[PDB]
Design a protein around this ligand. Structure first.
Ligand SMILES: [Mg+2]
Ligand SMILES: [Mg+2]
Ligand SMILES: [Mg+2]
Ligand SMILES: [Mg+2]
Ligand SMILES: [Mg+2]
Ligand SMILES: [Mg+2]
Ligand SMILES: [Mg+2]
Ligand SMILES: [Mg+2]
Ligand SMILES: [Mg+2]
Ligand SMILES: [Mg+2]
Ligand SMILES: [Mg+2]
Ligand code: NA
Lengths: 158, 157, 68, 276
RNA sequence: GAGUACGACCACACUUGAGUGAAAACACCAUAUCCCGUCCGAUUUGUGAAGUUAAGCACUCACAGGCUCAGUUAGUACUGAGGUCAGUGAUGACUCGGGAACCCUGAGUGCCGUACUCC
RNA sequence: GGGCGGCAUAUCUGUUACACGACAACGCAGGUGUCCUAAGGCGAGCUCAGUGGGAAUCUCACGUAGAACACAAGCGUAAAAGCUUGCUUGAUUAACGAUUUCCAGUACGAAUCGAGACUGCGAAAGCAAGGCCAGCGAUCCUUUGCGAAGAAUA
RNA sequence: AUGAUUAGAGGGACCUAUUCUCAAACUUUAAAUGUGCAAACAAACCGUGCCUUAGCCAAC
């Protein structure tokens, strides 16, 4: 069935600055995603982090770049029971950067949400319900998808 | 010392178990007229126009209707007399009372009987008193007695 | 000194001595004062008309009786 | 630790059926159904708009304890009996369905030919006539759970009904072309959206593109012939509103009785006992 | 025999697993020039129709969990009225009446309207 | 007993309290004289506390409210009564309308249903004259506001 | 459900199924005794009877 095809729903690039450092992170993220990010609030109400949400072909291109950065360094525990996985590649300069001396190197933290088509059922306003459990992406299905993309799953514990 | 407006209403002004929620659409759609008998029952989920705790579970006559409210006359004993207290509530706290249902049914039945007798039709047969005597022809006849096993059984352990 | 503050002990006896009088019938003292004003105003107009009709009806009754 | 244990189900109170199906907003429905208690239950009508994926539903509804009473309905899937046969879920279709429902209810109530509305759609705003000569039929608008954004098609059905002779109380604030800055309406933008000029522009661009508009491109639906089609559809509606589309087996499954289910369970128990 | 829209009562309707689904719908769905709204056409708004029942949805199943109605518990527990009743007493029975609850066990697993449409 | 102590002196929840209402103790466990231009009003979006999988706060599922609603408590509330946010001042005026609570069926304090004005929000139905229910004050005296202008042979 | 509480059993603690005991300020359930209203003469019923109304309703 063509409706069981696993696709990428989003990439969630996140910078956790924990002032001008957060501004440099915001500028870098905007230059890296062609899209204005949103600052986060901690919890006491200061801005701690900067994150963005990427979709479409921009998200797929960003995933290709970040995957090349890590060179297929996806351990098994990187994957989740929701069918999602992520990885953190430090020094964004690995992906094409300009190294403006005003904003130094920065450890972007990529995260990938893999899901199947038809998930609107759980997020639409009218008639919101639950996707059937057969239609959910599993850990194994995410494994198969990744090993089809770029490979490199080596088992670990910690 | 504490005597508030809602003093001692912990269990009175509370929803029944697994029956919480805002009033229902039938309550919104019920038409209340002056002269209707209504039961005053406080809806704890509204907290507007709610009757004082005294009038919960009293039945009275509607004397006044406003766009969102109902005026009910309620009898209230005090010392040696009963007053006729006019309370103001929102419509969510009254229910169409069934206190005259049997009387209305009786009057309807009398009109129906009058019409039938005017027409010469067959009146329903009369019910008979169950208290009259007669022959009993039993199906099973058993001995009613105390046995040993009863005293043996109703002892625990 | 210290003495007894409250009791209701003999009070229902006293209240029942001359009995608990029952309520006034609903058809007595049914003043409409303070009820919903638009309906009150309309009903007043109807009542004025009904008083005029009663006066005319009595006049006609007097004339018809005098006819006999 | 477990959240969904036996006690969880024992204490659980289900929502209303239409709430857990995600159809009815019961706060809004209660406020929409409510009237002055001094009205003593005099008739009150909701104009219901529910745009599905392929269809537009418009109803004149009366709330009753036994269930809502539908007086008149009109559907955007019944529009090709009036001309327009494509784009049955756009703004022009919503407008046409609204006008059809207005004319149908006014004819069924016998007050047609006495309340005409705006014969030519100009897109301007005229305040309704309400108690709040002879007053026009009044219904209130029920959008349901739809987002009431400026330009949304639910107000397209609203506008169609208003031009059809209804008195549906509204402000022009959500009609397409309303600018929230100046607090004013551009009636020409509303006119263009009513007669489908936006669809015509997008279709012309899609033709110059050389999946979208496929049934359009399978016919010879030129962009310049849209507006006349919608005008003629308006006229055909005003002519004959009763018009519609031209015109035992069972697939139910046998549920087995409780004794048969008991026999099935006993047999499975016997089998598992023998197998071990 | 079904579907959609609006519904009334609000689990016999819920939850968890599996299975099947005619037609028409419903919905997933495709897409952003315009109205409109987003960090993100995800949601939402507009325009659409290449595909799919994979999910939602509808029906079936489970010695399923809950829920509803019965029975059992039990004339038991408790209780209105009575005694110059018993007992040192705590209490208890008796006399004229009222009369439960849980555990457990049996059955059941939505229903009634308005309009419109498909077999 | 009085004194010392305390406040049971005005007053609010829960319990005492005996399945209508009422019900005492220097009975029990606690509150009150404030605080808020938003912590008031309305519309719209959203869902909370906690869990579990995953990324050198961000994510996806579960989640009957186990959070929150200024302050003690009870009650209530999940497309909200909570959180966010947009624009607002119904926290104004309101012809001596009626009513509840206390109760003598007197005031005071708090409430409830209204009628009129002028408005806020909303597409609309609607919803608002404060923050539900504790948070307060007679006579006399002092003190402030209202009785703009312009008209009328009266 | 909220609180208090003994012990084992299965996956030092955690969980899962229960088990020893129980609450004036806990409760799903729930009596007896109670407590409002009604039980035809200023009322109610029937007629789609007439008049009236600046009331409601799009009108009737
Ligand atoms: Mg109670
Ligand atoms: Mg004394
Ligand atoms: Mg009592
Ligand atoms: Mg009592
Ligand atoms: Mg007065
Ligand atoms: Mg006062
Ligand atoms: Mg109000
Ligand atoms: Mg207020
Ligand atoms: Mg508040
Ligand atoms: Mg208030
Ligand atoms: Mg207060
Ligand atoms: Na007003």
């Amino acid at each position: 069935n063509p409706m069981r095809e696993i696709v990428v729903k989003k990439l969630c690039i996140n910078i956790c600055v924990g002032g001008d450092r957060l501004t440099r992170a915001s500028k870098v993220l905007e230059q890296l995603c062609e899209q204005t990010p949103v600052l986060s609030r901690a919890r006491r109400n200061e801005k701690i982090a900067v994150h963005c949400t990427v979709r479409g072909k921009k998200a797929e291109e960003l995933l290709e770049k970040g995957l090349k950065v890590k060179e297929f360094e996806l351990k098994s525990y990187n994957f989740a029971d929701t069918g999602s996985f992520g990885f953190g590649i430090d020094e964004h300069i690995d992906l094409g950067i300009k190294y403006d001396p005003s904003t130094g190197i920065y450890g972007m933290d990529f995260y990938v949400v893999l899901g199947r088509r038809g998930e609107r059922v759980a997020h639409r306003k009218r008639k919101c319900s639950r996707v059937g459990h057969s239609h959910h992406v599993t850990k194994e299905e995410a494994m198969k998808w990744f090993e089809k993309v770029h490979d490199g799953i080596i088992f670990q514990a910690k | 010392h504490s005597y508030g407006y809602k003093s001692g209403t912990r269990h009175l002004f509370a929803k029944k178990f697994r029956k919480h929620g805002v009033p229902s659409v039938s309550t919104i759609l019920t038409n209340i007229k002056v002269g209707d008998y209504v039961d005053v029952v406080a809806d704890s989920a509204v907290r507007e126009g709610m009757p004082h705790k005294y009038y919960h579970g009293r039945t009275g006559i509607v004397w006044n209707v406003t766009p969102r409210g109902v005026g009910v006359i309620i009898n209230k004993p005090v010392r040696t007399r009963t007053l006729r207290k006019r309370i103001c509530v929102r419509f969510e706290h009254v229910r169409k009372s069934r206190c005259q249902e049997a009387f209305k049914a009786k009057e309807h039945q009398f009109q129906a009987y009058l019409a039938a007798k005017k027409a010469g039709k067959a009146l329903p047969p009369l019910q008979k008193s169950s208290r009259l005597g007669g022959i009993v022809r039993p199906k099973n006849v058993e001995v009613l007695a105390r046995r040993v096993a009863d005293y043996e059984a109703m002892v625990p352990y | 000194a210290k003495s007894k503050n409250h009791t209701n002990h003999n009070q229902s006896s006293k209240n029942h001595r001359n009995g608990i009088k029952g309520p006034v019938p609903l058809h007595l003292h049914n003043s409409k004062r303070g009820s919903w004003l638009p309906a009150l105003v309309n009903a007043r107009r109807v009542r004025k008309h009904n008083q005029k009709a009663a006066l005319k009806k009595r006049r006609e009754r007097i004339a018809a009786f005098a006819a006999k | 630790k477990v959240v969904k244990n036996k006690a969880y189900f024992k204490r659980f109170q289900v929502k209303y059926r239409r709430r857990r199906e995600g159809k009815t907003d019961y706060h809004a429905r209660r406020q929409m159904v409510l009237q002055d208690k001094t009205k003593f239950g005099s008739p009150k009508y909701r104009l219901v708009v529910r745009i599905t994926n392929k269809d537009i539903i418009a109803q004149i509804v009366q709330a009753k304890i036994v269930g809502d009473e539908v007086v008149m309905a009109a559907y955007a899937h019944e529009l090709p009996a009036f001309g327009i046969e494509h784009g049955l879920t756009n703004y022009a279709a919503a407008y046409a369905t609204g006008l059809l429902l207005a004319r149908r209810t006014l004819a069924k109530l016998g007050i047609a030919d006495k309340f005409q509305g705006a014969k030519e759609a100009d897109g301007s705003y005229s305040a309704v006539r309400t108690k709040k000569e002879r007053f026009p039929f009044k219904a209130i608008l029920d959008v349901g759970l739809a987002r009431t954004t400026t330009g949304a098609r639910v107000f397209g059905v609203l506008k169609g009904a208003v031009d059809g002779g209804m008195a549906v109380p509204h402000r022009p604030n959500r009609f397409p072309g309303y600018n929230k800055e100046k607090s004013s309406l551009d009636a020409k933008v509303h006119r263009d959206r009513i007669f489908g000029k936006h669809v015509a522009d997008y279709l012309k661009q899609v033709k110059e593109e050389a999946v979208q508009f496929s049934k359009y491109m399978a016919a010879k639906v030129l962009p310049e012939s849209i507006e006349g089609m919608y005008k003629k559809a308006h006229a055909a509606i005003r002519a004959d509103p009763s018009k519609s589309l031209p015109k035992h087996k069972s697939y139910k499954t046998k549920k087995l009785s409780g004794a048969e289910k008991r026999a099935a369970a006993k047999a499975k128990v016997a089998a598992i006992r023998e197998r071990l």
